[PDB]
Coordinates of N, CA and C and ligand atoms in Angstrom, one line a residue:
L1 N 17.9 42.7 -13.4 CA 18.9 43.9 -12.7 C 20.4 43.9 -13.2
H2 N 21.1 45.0 -13.1 CA 22.6 45.0 -13.1 C 23.4 45.7 -12.4
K3 N 24.6 45.3 -12.0 CA 25.3 45.8 -11.0 C 26.0 46.7 -11.5
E4 N 26.3 48.0 -11.2 CA 26.6 49.2 -11.3 C 28.3 49.9 -10.5
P5 N 28.8 50.3 -10.7 CA 30.1 50.7 -10.3 C 29.9 51.8 -9.0
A6 N 30.4 52.0 -7.6 CA 30.1 53.2 -6.7 C 31.6 53.0 -5.9
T7 N 31.5 54.0 -5.5 CA 33.0 53.9 -4.4 C 32.2 54.7 -2.7
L8 N 32.6 53.8 -1.5 CA 32.3 54.5 -0.6 C 32.5 56.2 0.0
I9 N 31.6 56.5 0.2 CA 31.9 57.7 0.7 C 32.2 57.9 2.4
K10 N 30.8 57.1 2.8 CA 30.7 57.0 4.6 C 29.9 55.9 4.9
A11 N 30.1 55.0 5.6 CA 29.4 53.7 6.1 C 28.1 55.0 7.1
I12 N 27.0 54.9 7.4 CA 26.1 55.8 8.2 C 25.6 54.8 8.9
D13 N 24.9 53.9 8.7 CA 24.2 53.1 9.8 C 23.9 51.4 9.3
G14 N 23.0 50.6 10.0 CA 23.0 49.4 9.3 C 22.5 49.5 8.0
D15 N 21.7 50.3 7.7 CA 21.1 50.2 6.4 C 21.1 51.6 5.2
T16 N 21.8 52.4 5.6 CA 22.2 53.5 5.0 C 23.7 53.7 4.7
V17 N 24.1 54.0 3.5 CA 25.9 53.8 3.1 C 25.7 55.2 2.2
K18 N 26.2 55.7 2.5 CA 26.8 57.1 1.4 C 28.0 56.9 0.4
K19 N 27.5 57.0 -1.1 CA 28.6 56.6 -1.5 C 28.5 57.6 -2.6
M20 N 29.8 57.7 -3.8 CA 30.0 58.0 -5.2 C 29.2 57.3 -6.0
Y21 N 28.0 58.0 -6.6 CA 27.6 57.3 -7.9 C 27.5 58.0 -9.0
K22 N 28.2 57.7 -10.2 CA 28.0 58.4 -11.5 C 28.6 59.9 -11.1
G23 N 29.5 59.7 -10.2 CA 30.2 61.0 -10.2 C 29.7 61.9 -8.7
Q24 N 28.6 61.3 -8.3 CA 27.7 62.3 -7.4 C 27.3 61.9 -6.3
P25 N 27.8 62.5 -5.2 CA 27.6 61.8 -3.8 C 25.9 61.5 -3.5
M26 N 25.8 60.4 -2.8 CA 24.2 59.9 -3.1 C 24.2 59.2 -2.1
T27 N 23.3 59.0 -1.0 CA 23.0 58.4 0.3 C 22.0 57.3 -0.4
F28 N 22.5 56.0 -0.1 CA 21.4 54.8 -0.3 C 20.9 54.1 0.9
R29 N 19.8 53.9 0.7 CA 19.0 53.0 1.8 C 18.6 51.6 1.3
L30 N 19.6 50.9 1.7 CA 19.2 49.4 1.3 C 17.5 48.9 1.1
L31 N 17.5 48.2 0.1 CA 16.3 47.5 -0.3 C 15.9 46.4 0.5
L32 N 14.5 46.5 0.9 CA 13.8 45.0 1.4 C 14.3 44.8 3.0
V33 N 15.1 45.8 3.5 CA 15.7 45.6 5.2 C 15.2 46.5 6.1
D34 N 15.4 46.2 7.1 CA 15.1 47.3 8.2 C 15.9 46.9 9.2
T35 N 17.2 47.6 9.3 CA 18.1 47.6 10.8 C 17.7 48.4 11.8
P36 N 17.9 48.0 13.4 CA 17.1 48.9 14.1 C 18.4 50.1 14.2
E37 N 17.8 51.2 14.6 CA 18.4 52.8 14.6 C 19.2 52.5 15.3
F38 N 20.5 53.0 15.5 CA 21.9 53.2 16.1 C 21.4 53.1 17.9
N39 N 20.4 53.9 18.2 CA 19.9 53.9 19.6 C 19.0 52.6 20.1
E40 N 18.9 51.6 19.2 CA 17.9 50.6 19.6 C 18.7 49.2 19.7
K41 N 18.5 48.5 20.3 CA 19.0 47.3 20.4 C 19.4 46.3 19.3
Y42 N 20.4 46.3 19.1 CA 21.5 45.6 17.9 C 22.0 46.4 16.7
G43 N 21.1 48.0 17.1 CA 21.7 49.1 16.3 C 23.4 49.5 15.9
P44 N 23.7 49.6 16.9 CA 25.2 49.4 16.9 C 25.9 48.0 16.3
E45 N 25.3 47.2 16.5 CA 26.0 45.8 16.1 C 25.9 45.8 14.4
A46 N 24.4 46.6 14.1 CA 24.2 46.6 12.7 C 24.7 47.5 12.0
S47 N 25.0 48.6 12.5 CA 26.1 49.7 11.7 C 27.1 49.0 11.4
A48 N 28.0 48.7 12.8 CA 29.1 48.2 12.4 C 29.3 46.9 11.7
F49 N 28.1 45.8 11.6 CA 28.3 45.0 10.7 C 28.3 45.5 9.3
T50 N 27.7 46.6 8.9 CA 27.4 47.0 7.6 C 28.7 47.9 7.2
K51 N 29.3 48.9 8.3 CA 30.4 49.3 8.2 C 31.5 48.6 7.8
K52 N 32.0 47.8 8.5 CA 32.9 46.8 8.0 C 32.9 46.5 7.0
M53 N 31.7 45.8 6.4 CA 31.6 45.2 5.2 C 31.7 46.1 4.2
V54 N 31.2 47.1 3.9 CA 31.3 48.3 2.8 C 32.9 48.9 3.0
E55 N 33.4 48.7 4.3 CA 35.0 49.3 4.2 C 35.9 48.2 3.9
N56 N 35.9 47.3 4.1 CA 36.7 46.1 3.6 C 36.8 45.7 2.4
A57 N 35.6 46.6 1.6 CA 35.4 45.8 0.4 C 36.4 46.6 -0.6
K58 N 37.0 45.9 -1.8 CA 37.5 46.4 -3.0 C 36.9 46.9 -3.9
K59 N 35.4 46.0 -4.0 CA 34.9 47.0 -4.8 C 33.5 46.6 -4.6
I60 N 32.8 48.1 -4.6 CA 31.6 48.0 -4.2 C 30.6 48.4 -5.2
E61 N 29.3 47.7 -5.4 CA 28.4 47.4 -6.6 C 27.0 48.0 -6.0
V62 N 26.4 48.9 -6.9 CA 25.1 49.1 -6.9 C 24.2 48.6 -7.6
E63 N 22.8 47.7 -7.2 CA 22.0 47.3 -7.8 C 20.6 47.8 -8.2
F64 N 20.2 48.6 -8.9 CA 18.6 49.2 -8.7 C 17.6 48.3 -9.3
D65 N 16.7 48.2 -8.5 CA 15.4 47.2 -9.1 C 14.5 47.8 -10.0
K66 N 13.4 47.3 -10.1 CA 12.5 47.4 -11.4 C 11.8 48.9 -11.2
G67 N 11.3 48.8 -9.9 CA 10.5 49.9 -9.6 C 11.3 51.2 -9.5
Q68 N 11.0 52.2 -8.3 CA 11.6 53.6 -8.2 C 13.0 53.7 -7.3
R69 N 14.0 54.2 -7.7 CA 15.5 54.5 -7.7 C 15.9 55.5 -6.7
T70 N 14.6 56.3 -6.0 CA 14.9 57.2 -5.2 C 13.6 57.5 -4.1
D71 N 14.1 57.2 -2.8 CA 13.1 57.5 -2.1 C 12.3 59.0 -1.9
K72 N 11.4 59.2 -0.7 CA 10.8 60.5 -1.1 C 11.7 61.3 0.1
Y73 N 13.0 61.1 0.5 CA 14.1 61.5 1.2 C 15.1 61.7 0.5
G74 N 14.8 61.5 -1.0 CA 15.9 61.5 -2.2 C 17.3 60.3 -1.6
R75 N 16.9 59.2 -1.2 CA 17.6 58.5 -0.9 C 17.7 57.4 -2.1
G76 N 18.7 56.8 -2.7 CA 18.9 55.9 -3.7 C 18.3 54.7 -3.2
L77 N 17.9 53.6 -3.7 CA 17.3 52.5 -3.1 C 17.9 51.6 -3.7
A78 N 18.7 50.7 -3.5 CA 19.4 49.5 -4.1 C 19.7 48.5 -3.2
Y79 N 20.0 47.4 -4.4 CA 20.8 46.1 -3.3 C 22.2 46.5 -3.4
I80 N 23.1 46.4 -2.5 CA 24.6 46.8 -2.6 C 25.2 45.5 -2.0
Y81 N 26.4 45.7 -3.2 CA 27.4 44.4 -2.9 C 28.9 45.0 -2.5
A82 N 29.3 44.1 -1.6 CA 31.0 44.0 -1.3 C 31.3 43.0 -1.7
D83 N 32.4 43.3 -2.7 CA 33.0 42.2 -3.6 C 31.9 41.0 -4.1
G84 N 30.8 41.3 -4.3 CA 30.2 39.9 -4.7 C 29.2 39.7 -3.7
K85 N 29.5 40.1 -2.7 CA 28.2 39.7 -1.7 C 27.4 40.9 -1.3
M86 N 26.2 40.4 -1.4 CA 24.9 41.2 -1.2 C 25.0 41.6 0.3
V87 N 24.9 42.7 0.9 CA 24.8 43.4 2.4 C 23.6 43.3 2.9
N88 N 22.6 43.7 1.9 CA 21.4 43.3 2.4 C 20.8 42.0 2.8
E89 N 21.3 41.1 1.8 CA 21.3 39.8 2.4 C 21.9 39.4 3.3
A90 N 22.9 39.8 3.6 CA 23.9 39.7 4.8 C 23.7 39.9 6.2
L91 N 22.8 41.0 6.1 CA 22.4 41.8 7.3 C 21.2 40.9 7.7
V92 N 20.3 40.5 6.9 CA 19.2 39.7 7.5 C 19.9 38.2 7.5
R93 N 20.9 37.7 6.9 CA 21.0 36.2 7.3 C 21.7 36.3 8.8
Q94 N 22.4 37.5 9.2 CA 23.0 37.4 10.3 C 21.9 37.9 11.5
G95 N 20.5 38.5 11.2 CA 19.4 38.4 12.1 C 19.7 39.9 12.6
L96 N 20.6 40.4 12.0 CA 20.8 42.0 12.1 C 20.0 43.0 11.5
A97 N 19.0 42.6 10.6 CA 17.7 43.4 9.7 C 16.8 42.2 9.7
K98 N 15.4 43.0 9.5 CA 14.2 42.0 9.3 C 14.0 42.4 7.5
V99 N 13.3 41.7 7.3 CA 13.0 42.0 5.9 C 11.5 43.0 6.2
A100 N 11.5 43.7 5.1 CA 10.9 44.8 5.3 C 11.1 46.1 4.3
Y101 N 9.6 46.8 4.1 CA 9.5 47.4 3.0 C 9.2 47.4 1.7
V102 N 8.7 46.1 1.5 CA 8.5 45.4 0.5 C 7.7 46.0 -0.4
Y103 N 7.8 46.6 -1.3 CA 6.6 47.3 -2.0 C 6.7 46.7 -3.3
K104 N 5.6 46.8 -4.4 CA 5.5 46.0 -5.8 C 6.3 46.4 -6.3
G105 N 7.3 47.9 -6.6 CA 7.8 48.0 -7.7 C 9.2 47.3 -7.5
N106 N 9.5 46.8 -6.3 CA 11.1 46.9 -6.2 C 11.6 45.4 -5.3
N107 N 10.9 44.3 -5.7 CA 11.2 43.2 -4.8 C 11.8 41.9 -5.5
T108 N 12.6 42.1 -6.5 CA 13.1 41.1 -7.0 C 13.9 40.1 -6.0
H109 N 14.5 40.8 -5.3 CA 15.2 39.8 -3.9 C 14.4 39.3 -2.8
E110 N 13.4 39.2 -3.1 CA 12.2 39.2 -1.4 C 12.4 38.0 -1.3
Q111 N 12.6 36.7 -2.1 CA 12.6 35.6 -1.6 C 13.7 35.3 -1.1
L112 N 14.6 35.4 -1.7 CA 16.2 35.4 -1.3 C 16.3 35.7 -0.1
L113 N 15.9 36.9 0.4 CA 16.3 37.6 1.8 C 15.3 36.8 2.8
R114 N 14.1 36.9 2.4 CA 13.0 35.5 3.1 C 13.7 34.5 3.6
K115 N 14.2 33.9 2.4 CA 14.9 32.4 2.6 C 16.2 32.9 4.1
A116 N 17.2 33.9 3.6 CA 18.1 34.1 5.0 C 17.4 34.3 6.3
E117 N 16.3 35.2 6.4 CA 15.6 35.3 7.9 C 15.0 34.3 7.8
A118 N 14.6 33.1 7.1 CA 14.2 32.0 7.8 C 15.2 31.2 8.7
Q119 N 16.5 31.4 7.8 CA 17.6 30.6 8.2 C 18.3 31.5 9.9
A120 N 18.3 32.6 10.0 CA 18.6 33.6 10.5 C 17.4 33.5 12.0
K121 N 16.2 33.1 11.7 CA 15.6 32.8 12.7 C 15.6 31.8 13.3
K122 N 15.4 30.6 12.3 CA 16.0 29.3 12.8 C 16.8 29.3 14.2
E123 N 18.1 29.9 13.7 CA 18.9 29.9 14.8 C 19.2 30.7 16.1
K124 N 17.6 31.6 16.0 CA 17.9 32.8 17.0 C 18.9 33.9 17.0
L125 N 19.3 34.4 16.0 CA 20.5 35.0 15.5 C 20.1 36.5 16.1
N126 N 20.9 37.3 16.8 CA 20.8 38.4 17.1 C 19.3 38.9 17.2
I127 N 18.8 39.5 16.5 CA 17.5 40.1 16.6 C 16.3 38.9 17.5
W128 N 16.8 37.7 16.6 CA 15.6 36.8 16.7 C 15.8 35.9 18.5
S129 N 16.4 36.3 19.2 CA 17.1 35.6 20.5 C 16.7 36.6 21.7
Ligands
THP1 C1 13.4 50.9 2.2 C2 12.7 51.9 1.8 C3 12.3 52.8 2.5 N1 11.2 54.0 2.4 C4 10.6 55.3 3.2 C5 9.7 54.9 3.7 C6 9.6 55.3 5.1 O1 9.0 56.3 5.0 P1 8.6 57.2 6.7 O2 9.8 57.9 7.1 O3 7.7 58.2 6.2 O4 8.4 56.2 7.7 C7 11.5 55.4 5.3 C8 12.0 54.3 6.1 O5 13.1 54.2 6.5 P2 14.1 54.4 7.9 O6 14.0 52.7 7.8 O7 15.8 54.6 6.9 O8 13.7 55.4 8.4 O9 11.9 55.2 4.0 C9 10.8 53.8 0.8 O10 9.9 54.6 0.6 N2 11.2 53.0 -0.1 C10 11.7 51.6 0.5 O11 12.1 50.6 -0.5
CA2 CA1 16.4 51.5 9.8

């Protein structure tokens, strides 16, 4: 995989972030994770965690996997990095996301995130408490 430049347009919720990528507004859905909806328990915290994380970053990078790059709603499907720290992995580590939507095309960082979910569960963090 490789990291590509992008600039925040807007944080949306725990696992979707609108960015400008190669000149175009594009809504990104985070690969391999599922944050609760804003109206569910931990939703607002998931949204706020992702928001602070993308908003504080000086450098945002987008990383496509090997499978499909857009979902059926036209959302980019990526691993997202804030100053070199992967948001996807970071939500899971804090028990603000579950590992999810693991499809065959698109799972490079699957074990990494499951590793994080193991440690999150280990500590009864947010969702696991
Ligand atoms: C994360 C992800 C979601 N999706 C689709 C499947 C789900 O379809 P359905 O809407 O038919 O359930 C939806 C879940 O996203 P949200 O969790 O943002 O709702 O997005 C993909 O197709 N590929 C992916 O990698
Ligand atoms: Ca979700």
